[PDB]
Amino acid sequence: MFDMMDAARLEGLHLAQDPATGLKAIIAIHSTRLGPALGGCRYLPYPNDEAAIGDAIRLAQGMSYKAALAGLEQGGGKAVIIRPPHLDNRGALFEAFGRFIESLGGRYITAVDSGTSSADMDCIAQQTRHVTSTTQAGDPSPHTALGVFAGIRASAQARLGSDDLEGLRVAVQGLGHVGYALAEQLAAVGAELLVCDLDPGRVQLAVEQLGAHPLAPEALLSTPCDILAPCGLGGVLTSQSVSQLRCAAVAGAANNQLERPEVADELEARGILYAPDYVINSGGLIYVALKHRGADPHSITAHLARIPARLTEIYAHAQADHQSPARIADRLAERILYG
Amino acid sequence: MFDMMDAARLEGLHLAQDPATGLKAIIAIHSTRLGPALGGCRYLPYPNDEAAIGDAIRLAQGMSYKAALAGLEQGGGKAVIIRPPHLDNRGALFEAFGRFIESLGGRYITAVDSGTSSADMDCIAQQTRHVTSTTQAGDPSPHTALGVFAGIRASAQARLGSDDLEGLRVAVQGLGHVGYALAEQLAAVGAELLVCDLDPGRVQLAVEQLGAHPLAPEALLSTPCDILAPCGLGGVLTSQSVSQLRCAAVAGAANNQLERPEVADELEARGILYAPDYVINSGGLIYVALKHRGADPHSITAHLARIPARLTEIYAHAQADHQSPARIADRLAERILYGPQ
Numbered sequence: 168m169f170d171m172m173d174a175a176r177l178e179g180l181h182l183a184q185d186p187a188t189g190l191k192a193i194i195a196i197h198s199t200r201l202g203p204a205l206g207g208c209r210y211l212p213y214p215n216d217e218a219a220i221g222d223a224i225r226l227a228q229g230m231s232y233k234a235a236l237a238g239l240e241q242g243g244g245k246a247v248i249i250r251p252p253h254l255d256n257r258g259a260l261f262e263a264f265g266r267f268i269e270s271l272g273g274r275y276i277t278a279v280d281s282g283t284s285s286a287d288m289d290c291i292a293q294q295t296r297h298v299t300s301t302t303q304a305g306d307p308s309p310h311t312a313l314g315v316f317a318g319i320r321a322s323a324q325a326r327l328g329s330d331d332l333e334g335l336r337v338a339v340q341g342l343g344h345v346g347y348a349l350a351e352q353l354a355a356v357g358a359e360l361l362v363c364d365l366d367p368g369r370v371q372l373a374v375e376q377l378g379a380h381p382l383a384p385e386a387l388l389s390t391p392c393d394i395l396a397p398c399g400l401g402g403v404l405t406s407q408s409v410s411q412l413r414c415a416a417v418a419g420a421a422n423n424q425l426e427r428p429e430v431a432d433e434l435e436a437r438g439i440l441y442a443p444d445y446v447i448n449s450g451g452l453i454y455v456a457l458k459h460r461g462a463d464p465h466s467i468t469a470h471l472a473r474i475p476a477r478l479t480e481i482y483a484h485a486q487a488d489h490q491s492p493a494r495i496a497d498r499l500a501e502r503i504l505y506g
Numbered sequence: 507m508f509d510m511m512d513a514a515r516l517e518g519l520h521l522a523q524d525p526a527t528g529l530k531a532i533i534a535i536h537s538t539r540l541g542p543a544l545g546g547c548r549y550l551p552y553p554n555d556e557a558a559i560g561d562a563i564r565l566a567q568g569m570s571y572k573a574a575l576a577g578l579e580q581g582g583g584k585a586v587i588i589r590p591p592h593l594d595n596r597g598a599l600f601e602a603f604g605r606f607i608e609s610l611g612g613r614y615i616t617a618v619d620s621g622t623s624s625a626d627m628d629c630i631a632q633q634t635r636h637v638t639s640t641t642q643a644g645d646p647s648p649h650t651a652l653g654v655f656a657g658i659r660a661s662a663q664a665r666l667g668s669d670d671l672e673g674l675r676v677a678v679q680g681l682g683h684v685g686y687a688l689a690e691q692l693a694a695v696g697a698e699l700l701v702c703d704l705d706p707g708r709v710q711l712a713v714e715q716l717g718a719h720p721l722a723p724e725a726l727l728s729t730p731c732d733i734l735a736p737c738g739l740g741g742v743l744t745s746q747s748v749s750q751l752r753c754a755a756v757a758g759a760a761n762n763q764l765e766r767p768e769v770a771d772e773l774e775a776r777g778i779l780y781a782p783d784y785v786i787n788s789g790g791l792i793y794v795a796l797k798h799r800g801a802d803p804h805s806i807t808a809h810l811a812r813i814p815a816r817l818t819e820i821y822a823h824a825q826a827d828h829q830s831p832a833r834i835a836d837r838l839a840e841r842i843l844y845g846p847q
Contacts, residue, residue: 168507168521168555168559169521169523169530169555169588170555172521172523173523173525176525177523178522178523178524179520179521179522179523179606179609180520180521180522181518181519181520181521182507182508182511182518182519182520183517183518183519184508184511184512184516184517184518185517186512186515191508216507216508216509249508267518270518270610270611270613271609271610271611272609272610272611274609
C-alpha cells in the first residue's frame with residue numbers, strides 16, 4: 168500500500184478490523200502540517216479492499232487541499248468503512264469505529280459522508296470526542312449553500328462583468344438540502360432559475376415554492392444558461408459533458424466535480440469559467456471545523472466571508488497565466504501543503 | 507490487507523511513509539487486551555511491501571501469544587521498517603519512526619530486533635517514551651538464560667521425575683550471550699554439560715571455566731543426552747533432525763526452533779518432551795516489560811517464575827489431553843487472548 172500512499176503523498180494509513188462488530192475501517196491521514204486531520208467517514212459497499220483503501224487515500228488528499236485553501240488550521244483525512252452484507256448491530260459497529268478513532272488520539276477528526284448519518288456520529292461520540300456533525304450539532308448545509316451563492320456572485324463578476332444575478336439564467340442540478348437552499352437564494356435574488364433532481368417531488372416543491380423552471384436531468388447539464396451549478400453526485404464534469412456545456416461558467420456545491428484533472432483544461436479551452444469545487448463549497452467545512460475547535464465567532468464570520476474573495480483572487484491569477492483556475496488552486500494548495 | 511488481518515485476528519495495522527527521511531514503516535498491533543502492545547522493531551530489506559506487511563502481522567500475533575503465556579499485562583505488536591537501498595542518514599529515519607510510535611499514544615512500545623540496535627533505540631528515545639532496550643538499559647540476555655534454566659528444571663521433572671539436574675547430561679547448542687550463561691548456570695547445578703558452538707574458543711572457555719565436554723558442532727544434535735538445549739539458529743528441529751535425536755527432552759533458548767508445526771507432533775511421537783520455545787525463552791521479555799513499568803527486583807523474580815509455572819501447567823494438560831505441549835500452549839494462549847475473561 169506504500170505505492171498508493173506515495174502517489175498521494177499521504178502521511179499515514181490506519182486499518183482496523185473487528186469481527187465482534189463486523190467493523191472493517193480505514194482511516195487515511197493525508198496531511199497534518201496545518202493541524203489535526205478532519206474528514207468525513209463513508210460507510211459504503213465496495214468491490215474490494217484495495218478500492219476502499221484507494222478511495223480513502225484519494226479523498227483524504229482532497230480534504231487537505233480544501234482545508235488548506237479555506238485557511239483553516241486543519242489537515243486532510245478520510246475514513247472509509249466497508250459495508251458488511253449481514254450487520255446485526257449497526258451502532259455497536261460505529262462504537263467500535265469511535266474506539267478506532269480514539270486510538271489515534273486526535274490526529275483524525277471524523278464527520279458525516281455517504282452512507283453515514285448524524286445518527287452514527289452520535290454512536291461514535293460515545294467512544295471519542297474527535298467527531299463532528301452529531302445530531303446535536305447543526306445541519307451545516309446552509310453555510311455551504313450561502314458560500315456557493317457568494318461564489319456564483321463572484322464568478323458572474325469575473326466571467327460576465329457584473330455580480331448582479333437578477334434575470335441571469337442559472338441551472339441548479341440537484342435539490343438536496345444544499346441544492347434547494349442555493350436554489351431558494353437564487354429565486355429570491357430574481358435569477359431565472361432552472362432546476363432538476365431525480366426526486367420528481369423535490370422538483371415540484373421548487374416549481375411550486377421558488378417559481379423554478381423544471382428540466383429533465385439529461386437536459387439540464389446542457390441547457391443554455393449563464394451559470395451551471397452542479398449540486399449532485401460527483402464526476403458531473405467529464406470530457407463528454409464539457410463538450411455539451413452551454414453555460415458561461417460552472418459554479419456549484421458538489422464535491423469532486425472534475426472526473427479527471429485534465430477536464431479543467433477542457434473547460435478553460437472552451438472559455439467556460441470553472442469555480443474549483445473545493446474552494447467554492449468549503450462553507451460547510453469552515454463552520455464545522457471552527458465550531459469543533461471552539462474558535463472565536465469573529466473568526467468564523469471572517470473565514471466564511473472570504474470564499475468569494477478567494478475565488479476572485481484565483482480568477483485573477485488564472486487570467487494572468489492563461490491557466491485553468493483549478494490549476495491555480497492546486498498549486499496554491501501544494502505550496503501550502505508541500506513547500 | 508483485511509484478509510490477512512482477519513486471518514491473524516489483528517486489531518490494527520498502521521503505516522507511515524516519509525520521503526524526506528526515507529521512512530517506510532509498519533506497526534502491527536495484534537492485541538491490546540492484556541495491556542499496551544510491546545514488540546521489537548526490525549529493519550530489513552524486503553522484496554515487496556506485501557512481504558513486509560505480512561511479516562509485521564504474523565510476528566505481532568506471535569508476540570501476543572508470547573506475552574500472554576508469560577503472564578504479562580502486555581499486548582503483542584511488531585514494527586517492520588523497510589530498509590531503503592540508499593539512506594543518509596540513519597538517525598533521522600529512526601527519529602521519524604520515534605515520531606510514528608508517539609503518534610499511537612503508548613498503544614505500542616518498541617524494542618530491538620533483527621536489523622536494529624540499542625543505538626537506534628537511542629534515537630527513537632528522543633521522540634517518544636514508548637521505547638525499550640536503549641543503551642542505558644540492562645542487557646536482557648542473563649534473564650533469558652535464567653528463565654531457560656528454570657524451564658529446563660521443569661522439563662526434567664515432567665520428563666524424568668524430578669527437577670534435579672545434578673548428574674544429568676545436558677547438551678547446549680550455541681554458546682552466545684544466552685547460550686553460555688545457561689551453560690554456566692548448569693555446571694553450577696552439578697550437571698554433565700556437553701557443548702558445541704561455531705567459535706572454538708567459546709568451547710575451550712566453557713571447557714576450561716565450567717567442566718564442559720567439547721562436542722563437534724555438526725554431531726551435537728544426535729549425541730546421547732538427557733536434555734538438548736538449542737540456543738542458536740532457529741529451525742534446528744526438522745523432520746530429519748528429530749529422527750536422529752537421542753535425548754529425552756528439548757528445552758533451549760533459541761527462537762523459532764520448530765521448522766514447521768508438524769515437528770511438534772513428530773517429537774511427541776518419539777516420546778521426546780518439547781518445551782515451547784516462546785514460553786521457555788520469555789525471560790528477556792518479562793524483564794524488559796517489567797523494567798519499563800518500573801518494577802522492584804522482587805517483582806521481576808516472582809514474574810520470572812511464570813516460565814516454570816506455565817511450562818508445568820502445559821506439561822500437565824499435555825499429558826492429560828495426550829497432546830503436544832506446543833498445541834496445549836497455543837490453545838491456552840488463545841483462551842487468554844480470544845476467550846472470555
